[PDB]
């Protein structure tokens, strides 16, 4: 019912954030299910290094933004308190 999405950059950072979220949700109750890690979006683009004649010189840049989400079967007052201690109703 209530889908709470969250995003981060580092794998350990998103793991710690989702662990804090799931610990608060286990403290609250309402039979919270486990985390749902979604595949991240890779934003790659090639960039010429120098402003003059060089075509081999191109660095490769990687963007790995972790996007996970948790699910709540029913919103209650304790869940609202744990929220106000991305959202989708």
């Amino acid at each position: 019912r209530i889908r709470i999405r969250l995003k981060a950059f580092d794998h350990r950072l998103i793991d710690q954030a989702t662990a804090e979220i799931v610990e608060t949700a286990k403290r609250t109750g309402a039979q919270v299910r486990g985390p749902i890690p979604l595949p991240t979006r890779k934003e790659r683009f090639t960039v010429l290094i120098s402003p003059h004649v060089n075509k081999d010189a191109r660095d490769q840049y990687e963007i790995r933004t972790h996007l996970r989400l948790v699910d709540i079967v029913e919103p209650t007052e304790k869940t609202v308190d744990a929220l106000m201690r991305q959202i989708s109703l």
């Binding site: 950059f9 934003e43 790659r44 683009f45 960039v47 010429l48 290094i49 120098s50 402003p51 660095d59 490769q60 840049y61 990687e62 963007i63 790995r64 933004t65």
Partner: protein
């Protein structure tokens, strides 16, 4: 990449945000084609009285801190050299060595 060129860019985007809504309604009344050919002629009349600027066709969206007309991306808003220097010194999240 000059002071004059970035002044041209800021005055162009200012004129675009000024005369955007009237040009948007003009493009809309040009787009709807069911009747009123005389109103279409008056629409292109108002469009020709409107200057050639103030349009996304005129918006070039060059760099901001350098104003480089080449090597631009619509995600960082800077030049290639400047985004490479930013990822070099490390003041932007991500942008590691892509190796797959």
């Amino acid at each position: 990449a000059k002071q004059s060129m970035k002044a041209r860019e800021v005055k162009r985007v200012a004129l675009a945000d000024k005369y955007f809504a009237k040009r948007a309604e003009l493009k809309a009344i040009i787009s709807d084609v069911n009747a009123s050919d005389e109103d279409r002629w008056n629409a292109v009349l108002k469009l020709q009285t409107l200057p050639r600027d103030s349009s996304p066709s005129r918006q070039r969206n060059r760099c901001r801190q350098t104003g480089r007309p080449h090597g631009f991306l619509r995600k960082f808003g800077l030049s290639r050299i400047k985004v490479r220097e930013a990822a070099m010194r490390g003041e932007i999240p991500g942008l590691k060595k892509a190796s797959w």
